[PDB]
């Protein structure tokens with residue numbers, strides 16, 4: 544399966560950790576966004592939205608990281624541990640995945656990207672949205688070891704890609720004790736952690 | 751099942767159309783967000799993220815509209831038509847759901863909300879993001895009647911809730927012929943269209 548990516552990119556890293564958790568070796572293809580490789584006809588034919596990550600599995604093309612993570616589990620997982628079939632367990636995971644995209648990582652992009660990609664001054668009011676997102680995550684973790692229940696799921700892996708990017712951005716995770724505990728645990732149990740962290744250090748260069 | 755909502759709210763309306771497509775009558779509960787009803791201790795116990803829509807099924811609380819829609823189909827659907835089990839079919843649906851949240855409806859909120867809720871001048875650069883989102887949707891619709899394939903799915907119902915909100919905002923959907931065709935068809939086939947449209951007319955009052 545082809546996997547169009549950049550190593551620093553959080554949504555790309557969430558997929559790579561899922562692949563490791565499934566014992567799948569993706570064919571990693573760097574896509575040079577700075578050079579506009581994603582905007583040429585050959586890439587637009589695969590993904591007309593011209594985003595990474597993009598997976599190509601035979602003649603099936605797919606994008607949106609969290610869709611790709613779930614696809615890998617549903618198609619290739621030997622059991623449903625990373626994405627349980629039980630509708631209520633799955634639903635908590637899905638809510639956490641939309642949280643990760645539209646609350647947590649959105650707060651990251653909105654506050655950091657203008658500084659690191661557009662040379663704009665930081666906006667303290669956008670920092671407060673990060674604090675709010677971490678507070679929610681801290682609450683979601685009350686009473687459980689993992690983000691959506693009692694075992695490692697794709698919710699954890701998505702959120703871990705995001706929170707590891709906050710670490711290298713110098714965000715003080717320690718102010719959210721449940722998050723800090725969950726994060727330290729995941730560095731020891733999440734498959735593909737080392738590759739995710741190496742990618743975080745590459746992203747860190749932007750700072 | 752309890753459903754905390756406002757009729758005007760697009761993410762609420764996507765869930766209502768899914769319930770109607772499943773033959774489920776939700777116990778609809780208006781929430782007074784302007785008065786901070788969602789910020790009270792009682793609501794925070796149900797949904798600490800204090801958002802609508804929120805579903806309560808017995809003792810199980812769930813939020814994120816697109817997670818709720820999929821939960822209703824997975825738990826209560828007599829077949830999987832609205833959310834097929836085939837991993838590739840489901841993955842396209844899921845990518846469209848994330849599109850709806852992070853690209854299409856994001857463009858709506860970013861451009862219109864500052865005008866209708868904050869009395870800020872429109873930002874023409876933010877309008878261009880709506881046009882880009884509609885261009886992508888127009889492309890996604892090439893060669894199929896529905897958003898993620900050849901049958902009505904939750905992807906259609908989420909996108910329909912969003913696009914019908916753009917209609918009452920006076921966005922010119924006719925500039926996107928595949929979107930226009932798909933939209934017109936869904937007004938005739940989507941269960942719960944009349945309730946969705948009544949709710950769009952409520953939202954229109956903010957303009």
Ligand SMILES: N[C@@H](CCC(=O)N[C@@H](CS)C(=O)NCC(=O)O)C(=O)O
Pocket residue numbers: 552554576581592593594595596606607608609644848852
């Ligand atoms: N919500 C998407 C985000 C993907 C995304 O925005 N990727 C950026 C990474 S720099 C990108 O490819 N941007 C290029 C573009 O949108 O043209 C996901 O989770 O996969």
Ligand SMILES: N[C@@H](CCC(=O)N[C@@H](CS)C(=O)NCC(=O)O)C(=O)O
Pocket residue numbers: 641645759761783788799800801802803813814815816851
């Ligand atoms: N991505 C969420 C969006 C939910 C949302 O933002 N709802 C607004 C509707 S006005 C809300 O409840 N805001 C109140 C708050 O966040 O305190 C979904 O699809 O359900």
